[PDB]
């Protein structure tokens, strides 16, 4: 790859990310003081497990659909075979959503933007799996310490998705090549902006995977990508 190719790849990834965010960062930041009242937190906790899962499942489906659009606009992804596109999305879409969450996360009070306001992990009590939700909130907290720019999140999430070690891939070296060009792009961007230090601070692949619920993987969205 040339300097021109790598610079064009950086631009493509960052443009795709920009066009596939549901919410604008500036709006998310302005809304930080808009926190659910105790009455509203109560209302969420009052819902049945099913009622809460129906709401959350829909929001996650939408989030996943934005990740799919992100992938489609990523230079090189649509050139991979259909099997591999699907394998990568199945294994990585939720991981991308969990990274994207830090944009909607407020480290100051440990809240996430959800249905129009900020709320803590106690909003999600009716779902059960309290340890997992805590672990998810802890994960966003750790990511928040890095102070990612949007271009950084864009390049990092591209690499979360384009992982040549996902079991079930049928063009392994082709995915390896795209992954490598994305590695070049990410490392390039970080060197030029003097941000190489974040490489050592990024959570490992295994960490992201452990945060993905079985219940998410069973959502019908994964049969209709
Ligand atoms: C953390 C939360 C829970 C996830 C989870 O997995 N919890 C474990 C669990 C527990 C029980 C369960 O259910 C059992 C009940 N059973 C199941 C079997 O059937 C019977 C009932 C299922 C799962 C999720 C839910 C919604 C997620 C938001 C959805 C959308 C966005 C927008 C996006 O903006 S953008 O600009 O970037 O695009 C940024 C991200 C953000 C903020 C998301 C952030 C994350 C959130 C809060």
């Amino acid at each position: 790859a040339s300097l021109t190719e790598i610079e064009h790849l950086v631009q493509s990834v960052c443009k795709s990310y920009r066009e596939t965010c549901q919410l604008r960062l500036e709006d998310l930041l302005r809304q930080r003081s808009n926190i659910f009242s105790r009455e509203e937190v109560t209302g969420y906790q009052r819902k049945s497990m099913w009622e809460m899962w129906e709401r959350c499942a829909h929001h996650l489906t939408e989030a996943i659909q934005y990740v799919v659009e992100f992938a489609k606009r990523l230079s090189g992804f649509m050139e991979l075979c259909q099997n591999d596109q699907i394998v990568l999305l199945k294994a990585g879409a939720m991981e991308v959503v969990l990274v994207r969450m830090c944009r909607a996360y407020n480290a100051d009070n440990r809240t996430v933007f959800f249905e129009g306001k900020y709320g803590g992990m106690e909003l999600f009590r009716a779902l059960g799996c309290s340890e997992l939700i805590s672990s998810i909130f802890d994960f966003s907290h750790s990511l928040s310490a890095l102070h990612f720019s949007e271009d950084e999140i864009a390049l990092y999430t591209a690499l979360v998705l384009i992982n040549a070690h996902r079991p079930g891939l049928q063009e392994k070296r082709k995915v390896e090549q795209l992954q490598y060009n994305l590695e070049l792009a990410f490392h390039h961007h970080l060197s030029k902006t003097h941000r190489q230090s974040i490489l050592a601070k990024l959570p490992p692949k295994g960490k992201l995977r452990s945060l993905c619920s079985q219940h998410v993987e069973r959502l019908q969205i994964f049969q209709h990508l």
Side-chain angles (χ1 to χ4, degrees):
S2 54
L3 188 69
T4 316
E5 283 168 65
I6 295 309
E7 287 177 328
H8 184 267
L9 179 56
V10 170
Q11 291 301 119
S12 175
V13 176
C14 294
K15 191 192 190 185
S16 176
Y17 177 80
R18 280 195 308 264
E19 292 166 346
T20 59
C21 286
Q22 205 173 327
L23 308 150
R24 309 206 315 285
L25 178 57
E26 58 203 62
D27 292 326
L28 285 166
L29 293 175
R30 191 182 300 116
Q31 296 263 54
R32 281 176 294 184
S33 74
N34 199 10
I35 298 143
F36 284 114
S37 61
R38 209 215 60 86
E39 190 175 10
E40 292 165 304
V41 172
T42 293
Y44 281 106
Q45 295 170 332
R46 280 187 85 193
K47 294 190 187 306
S48 72
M49 179 172 296
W50 183 90
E51 288 180 322
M52 197 53 178
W53 182 229
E54 192 277 331
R55 299 169 85 90
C56 291
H58 172 65
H59 299 310
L60 284 175
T61 299
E62 189 172 53
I64 292 167
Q65 289 165 334
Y66 277 95
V67 173
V68 173
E69 190 63 33
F70 173 66
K72 285 159 87 286
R73 298 181 189 197
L74 278 194
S75 171
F77 181 84
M78 291 312 278
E79 286 64 81
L80 305 169
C81 76
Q82 181 155 52
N83 172 78
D84 286 3
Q85 287 180 27
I86 298 300
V87 163
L88 292 170
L89 289 164
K90 280 186 178 159
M94 186 57 189
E95 289 171 10
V96 174
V97 172
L98 297 160
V99 175
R100 287 182 161 210
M101 177 173 161
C102 76
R103 293 170 79 256
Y105 179 79
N106 184 5
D108 292 350
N109 59 9
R110 304 175 155 71
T111 59
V112 68
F113 196 70
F114 178 83
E115 294 186 355
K117 302 189 205 183
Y118 280 90
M121 55 171 283
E122 67 274 10
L123 269 188
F124 303 93
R125 194 155 159 271
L127 290 173
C129 304
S130 166
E131 190 182 348
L132 175 59
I133 299 159
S134 193
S135 292
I136 290 175
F137 273 71
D138 290 345
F139 179 73
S140 272
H141 201 83
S142 69
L143 289 183
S144 298
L146 307 186
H147 321 294
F148 282 143
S149 70
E150 291 205 285
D151 288 352
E152 289 171 350
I153 293 175
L155 295 154
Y156 176 54
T157 59
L159 281 163
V160 168
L161 199 49
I162 312 307
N163 176 337
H165 303 87
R166 303 301 200 183
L169 291 169
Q170 282 188 295
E171 302 190 318
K172 198 172 176 289
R173 193 69 181 182
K174 187 174 174 64
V175 179
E176 289 178 65
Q177 190 56 60
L178 183 55
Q179 178 187 259
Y180 177 70
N181 288 331
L182 287 167
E183 278 170 352
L184 283 176
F186 193 32
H187 279 73
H188 173 79
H189 185 76
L190 297 182
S191 57
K192 277 195 89 203
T193 60
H194 314 268
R195 286 271 290 178
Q196 305 97 316
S197 58
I198 74 155
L199 289 169
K201 307 177 181 175
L202 299 175
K205 277 183 206 182
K207 183 60 188 176
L208 258 175
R209 188 168 64 256
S210 72
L211 306 167
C212 295
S213 171
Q214 323 77 29
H215 310 300
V216 177
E217 303 184 337
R218 297 320 295 169
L219 289 172
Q220 292 167 53
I221 175 65
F222 292 110
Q223 269 69 57
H224 302 266
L225 299 165

